[model samples]
Target: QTLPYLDPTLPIERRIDDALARMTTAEKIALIHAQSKFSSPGVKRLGIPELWMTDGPHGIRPEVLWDEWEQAGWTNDSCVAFPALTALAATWNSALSQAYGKALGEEARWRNKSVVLGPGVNIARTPLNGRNFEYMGEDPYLAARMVVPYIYGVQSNGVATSLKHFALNNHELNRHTTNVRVSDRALREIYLPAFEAAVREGKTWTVMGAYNLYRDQHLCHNQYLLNDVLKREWNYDGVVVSDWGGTHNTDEAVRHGLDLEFGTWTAYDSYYLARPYADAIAAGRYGTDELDDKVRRVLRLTYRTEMRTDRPRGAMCSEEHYAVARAVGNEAIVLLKNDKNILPLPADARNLLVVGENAIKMMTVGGGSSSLKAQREVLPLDGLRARFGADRVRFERGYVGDVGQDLRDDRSPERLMADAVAAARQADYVLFVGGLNKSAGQDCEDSDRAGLALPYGQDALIAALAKANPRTIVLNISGNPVAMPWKNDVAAILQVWMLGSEAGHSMADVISGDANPSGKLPFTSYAALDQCGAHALGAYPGQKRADSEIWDVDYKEDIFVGYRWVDRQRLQPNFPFGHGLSYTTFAYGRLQLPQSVAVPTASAPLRVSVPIANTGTRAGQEVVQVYVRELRPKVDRPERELKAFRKVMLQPGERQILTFDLDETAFRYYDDKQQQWVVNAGEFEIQIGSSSRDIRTKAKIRLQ
Candidate 1:
């Protein structure tokens, strides 16, 4: 008879058990750790292929040297680079997020990768956290709502997706050994929900542990986080992989549930898992059962990915992938301000001056590991020149900064400003495109940003240009929020994060009225750096010891993050979370809620439906946000919390009704004392609107 584990028709669990029974402890150890630069070797005797992992949240990475970080320089390695997750979050559309994941999956499938490690869910805790661009915004609900579909979309193509950095790797500075001290309630409430939803709702097959420690133990081997909470409490049975250098102790990793350890196999040294683990098993520190458990998860992960034969080919940089990128880019470009409504700039402008080095800068060169070698990209000056003709548009370097080596403009600023202001005085309209870049101290990994201001004197340049011509339109392009000091001086502002290959085309579409700006702010843009959640609590960037290797960073803000903190502290934000402008306007009317739904014993969900109408001349989309406030809570709470949101697109003069249904859990709080979530029976106010601060209407309901 044929071997059962090799039989494709056999039940997956049965096959896993059969395969585990056949594997030697040494083979099991090899399967649980990396065997190459981007992969762990699978058992050849068992007919298992090597599991290949690739770096990405946006697109499949280019070929690596297999043993080092050096590029393989393959002839056909170029692929489509999708918009960054920051741009994706701005869309505020889960459906698009799914499409994004699916497109990314197609590329991974083409590259023959078994796993795509990405779609980070770490809340944008601080603007200074260099990796903020890689995650959804600060609200747990928003992140949970947006992250679920991305997992589903990627896994649909037979490639496993890792929802990452596990618990709290909020800042990049001193990340390897920093101990983040946070409250249990805040952990469950603010940080854990997105990961929980990725596992429970999205059914993500893999998770990557963080580099830092929670409480005191490292996340890769932290029993309380990896086992007690993820496995026992949340019922998560997925495989846990270590972040590239995340694994430490062999016993703690094996017993506490790190199913696979990567980033340890290198040319220089053999690290944590393989040899040490195999010796430990033979020495009776652990038995074959522990080894087999790790193998079972590895086999399970392989079954989810490696076994598929119908994976797509020739999919990289396809026209379809390009179109998806363009559509996503079109929606993800957020119109932040439209004062005097100068956007949708007419093609008939006599003279259009485009000023900035970023106007032609290649976007995918930096951001450390997230960088991609794209097949092609469109520059803003190129797109604008094509749309309005070269004669009508005058491009200038304007200003230069200490951006990463590849992204910097080496032109003299003295020459740039002289020409820029001269052109600005004569031009009918000026489009100043500038914001953060993936430079070493800016948006790069291993470094947190210094502050939120636009780097390299761009802010001063914008002010000078505005003084020259009052019709200056500022396009701030970056992955995270940049505080605006000369905000009111500009006629309008648009926030376009690092879009992929279609960056230029998408910017043209939104600025030229071909695509209405619908994206919203994923996090609050504070009026100043000090007003931020971390700075308000004086816990930003944390402190380091003089002689000790490890340091402690206390999260004293607790659950008050982003808009929650800004509102509770009564501080003004440059722009609130969920804020975006459009070519058209929307009106909210007819707020309706269920007559009643018993709380703590509710038989049915309390449903709230509101009617929204597009009242302006142009068609546009609106992000209808719903929030809840505790009327007389026994404990302290923020002003309100975002519970749910919906992005709806409507034609001019058209109306659509949106509804949100909430169960008892929606009105609940994490009870640290009881170690569970409990709903308080009380009167609650429902605030619905376009942004967190601009609550258009309110409705009241009783929970019990």
Candidate 2:
């Protein structure tokens, strides 16, 4: 007597239908809402297992209490920590992103979790976004490219990645009540592309809704976003889970396409999808159609994950996972400024001075829900000591910042700075590692940064350190960009992100020349806050209404975000998007194009080729970026948009011919008036470069 729903050989649709037929209204209602802080109910009578989900994008979160955010105090819950999404995006290597996802998925599978609420693809619209560290980057193409591989890699281990925050969740200020207003073109072009790719291409198992609103309706159950764009237009079959506490009304949740409701109040049965929903349906106020649809999707997810016979039993805190973390951190650490080539500290230079609180800070702990209880976190000071010898490396705390609980520092800020300056003058090389931490209002969730300036008087400390030591190298360890007023004073600078367990090892690897620096800036580093679109337009954080607690934020810059706005304004960025330095140099040859110049179409794609050579003596990696500029357009467009890119690793004097195929999609733009992607018959410029601002070669072509 084997049930059809329990049979492994049956089709997924059949299995879902069989289960739906047997599920009572109470069982169906219970299945759609949380039974605990991180789980939903299952039909025990039918032997269906409950669904368990775990936070976050970077690493597997620790086990929490049944009804609270506090840890359950389990010793075995420590997992391997991976670099943040911004670091993964900075690498600009899809292969490495895939590896990151695979390792993360393995960890989630081992924890017996049904879903890993991660691979957040929200675009970094504003550098001031507190959660920018969790997203891919500011570019739609880049985010789209990076997110798909991560989805593929994670799902391969039979763990679902909740590609999240839905649409227009760019900022965190008043996130629960901020209603976003932007042009249709901006939504299609800048904001929604990454989410679209995750659905259409990556085929992600679940999509988490944002806490904000669109068209005055919360995104958790918005008709335009959830029903129109995501469900109907994009035809996304995956479950749509609400951001914890994001769901509002019972009627909307029932009809507007929310498949799973999580993070509501502590009273589990009182959730919008709980008794409220069932009571409404019982009173003939709603139908079972939508309920059945939601249950079907959830069952589909269960079959793909928990019920799948081939799902692998994953590993945790293994050497393999550590290698992934170290490898990603090594590539994600960007060498922003290397004036006079001060990096790769000279071999004979043994006396090293490590300054700043981040050098010894254990970053695995705070930073909202993405935080983890890592099995082991290697501090930057320890890593440097291991590489340069413990006795050879000297330590000096430049400043005290967000020292976690049970930690005490009795010294004054003046004394800490004076001590750091004194040590810097005597050491052969001064490595100052300080940047934004996961503390509230600075790179943490549920808040936004006040401004672009570095916090805790680090600007004054950096200026003083540079004066103390001519060989000062500032290693900024932050998730977002900060103004570097002392940019001209420091001998070198490295944009080190919140690298997880292997933070120290990876930092040492790049600084010691064990790994060449290749990571690029995922977002623009603005010289001033005014240079940014949101700040320049004065539409950030939104305006709160006098009557209600709601706030309204408008996307005045339209489709111009990141480099696009910087290019259009002709503003000089401290460091441009797609900008990064390397220990080795690279040269680009002439652009090679196809002979026929017909309009590129879906079937007939335009092919372009270029030869790149590593001119420097050392082996390194280079990202060959290709951007397309519409010379004559009916409407306004960014100066140039990233169309295609390839990451190639080469040895000294080694040259490789890279070819890019530009299809019609690459040459088209979203036509809000026409309500579709359109390409005009005109001249287009194909620009190739190492970075966006450093275009080396260009070719103009006419298309009919």
Candidate 3:
């Protein structure tokens, strides 16, 4: 009755030590691998409870069988499916992001899961990366800012959040076999910051290793990422969980820092950290201290979570949760192009034509680990019918199949084009809802897209519809960026991403002017696949090996990713990062900086403020973004880097002051030679902008 590990009065460290001291070597090994499909076996004699994990970055998943990814037929598995991370990233609102995490965390708590294996923080290296939907975006600063609050929100509800795919897991092509040869500078500056921020700032409880390799060592077993950078450098004391089937070597994995192996082929005896580890300990090849270290971390995490007696009775799909989902979905929508303000489609538009199969398709089914069984979902077609009268609106499946389809259909492509054109002719305006989905080639897991072209002949259909109606509004619902050959042909375009269960209602709200569009682009949308930040350098999806299983991808672009590449290379994109248009317009006033210019240091940040005015008539929100451009740098660098940003809502003609505090690190670059961040002493230009490319006002700041 007085088990120290189960005793609430004892300190966690002491409790963990008590539990580890009593456990046999076999039990210690079992503590580090999955004893069941979703959890590790807790020691019944020690009164330790099983620490369960579930799938999400969006919502808690249903029960899956022990041996496979197939779901078990459970009646209570259905839950509220929130919008994908891409959708959340689009909001550019940290408050909403924290709420997003809190809602999902509660659902995970209700499902009785201790660890929420989610918040995939991988940088969107390419628009074609298949799993880009679950990632935050292309910019590390943006991703870092968003990830901190999300982790804080989830853990606040007693469910732990795992910051995943540890490092350099950018490409989906040959993910398991590909070896990333990235520079230390790129790793620190662009790839590793978000995870660092999550651990240091958010105090993240767990980290899941990537499926790929870093410098030829598997991320799950890599000493550099797991031991050196994560644990030693950042001083992270959290558990490191391996990606499903990610552990390749038993010795390397255990000797390195993998605390838990989740899948590892689903065979308990075959697990790298399971039986082999036990034998290694017995054979005197591996030290008991190593096993104790892992067990200690596991116990530490276990004590912090579900073991608590004061856990909240969280709900899923409740009215409050749905509101959070709707609010997030409402804000994440970005208005890319509004030709003559054709959107906010007159709520009175008598005749409306909805084209494309996506209008009727479910948006949340194929996102790999993030997919969920939602209690209810809203499709774009249904949302439109509800907003406008059912009789006033017409729906047409202009194209057959989704982004996953191989572009093969029995119906003639010409016939589908004709159907859309005819529908466009009869209606006053054409609302074509199309984009990538959680399909094989689009936003699905494990496979990257073949190209940026619109699959299933959607580009052709849009062109035809544009010719027929000329008042065509396009809402792209995919997670990744798509080439817009038909961009100029549309009256308005909205990048809606793949919103969660409230997809339709949120879309309807924005389209009907019930909600103004304020979400910014998480990644850059280039005019063509060849023009993206990674592809523009012609350095991605590197040369395949003779056997085609393994290859090397060199990071020649270095720090020039996303808007950095676009700004430095002077490349024009279809849409830029932090670019979002609202129904109303905002004007930037004076740029106020400190009176006495001094050297900016990390400890003492420089505070800068700007006056923002809502110049347009309608009430809306605007994201105030601050960027710092090094006038002269010692090393090769991009034009500018994002330092700080704030999203503010305003009423018509309302004026509000936005402030940003910049530290030396904000304008500093990672020095690979020095193994530290060096701030160049010189004149730096501070830019205030709505988007990365669109700098409205700027002032010179001297850093001595």
Best-matching candidate per TM-score: 2
Q: Write the per-residue lDDT of candidate 1 for residues 338-371, one digit (tens) a residue.
A: 8888888886765899998778887776666887
Please list the residue runs of candidate 1 whose C-alpha ends up more than 4 Å from where it truly belongs after superposition.
Answer: 265-269, 312-314, 402-411, 545-547, 600-603
Off by over 4 Å in 3: 402-410, 546-549
lDDT of every model, 2 decimals: 0.84, 0.90, 0.86
Model 2: residue 536 alpha-carbon error in angstroms: 0.2
* Per-residue lDDT of candidate 3, residues 1-704 (tens digit): 88786678988888888888899887888888888778888776677888999988898888888766888878797888898898899898999989999998889888999999889889988888888888999889999999999998899998889888997888888888878998888899899988999999999999999988887899999998899988999998889998888899998988789998888764687899888888878888989888888988988888888678787778878998999999999999999999898888886787888988888888766666867888888889888888887588888778877433243445677888887798788899899999877768878887888888888778888889999998999999888888888888889999998887899999999999999999999888877776666786777887677875777888778888887887877878899888899899999987998873777766788989999999998999998899888888888787878779999999999999987878776778888899998777888889998998888889988887
User: What stretches of model 2 exceed 4 Å from their correct place?
Assistant: 404-407
Estimate the TM-score of every prediction.
0.97, 0.99, 0.97
lDDT of 2 by residue, 1-704 (tens): 78999988889899899999999999999999899889988787887888899997888899999989898988888999999999999999999989999999999998889999988878777879999988988999999999999999899999999988996899998999999999999999989989998999999999999999999999999999999999999998989998989998888898889999998864888999999998999999989998999999988888889878698899999999999999999999999899888888766568899998888888778876978999999999989988888478998988887764444578899998999999888989999999988889888998999889999899999999999988999998888889989999999989999999999999999999999999988888889988888889998889999999999999998999989999999999889988889999999999998763887776778999999999999999998899999988998999999989999999999999998989987788988889999889899999999888989999988888
How far in Å is the alpha carbon of 38 misplaced in model 1? 0.1
How many collisions per candidate?
A: 0, 1, 1
Q: Write down the lDDT that model 3 would get.
A: 0.86
Best by lDDT: 2
Q: How far does residue 630 in candidate 3 sit from its true spot (Å)?
A: 0.1
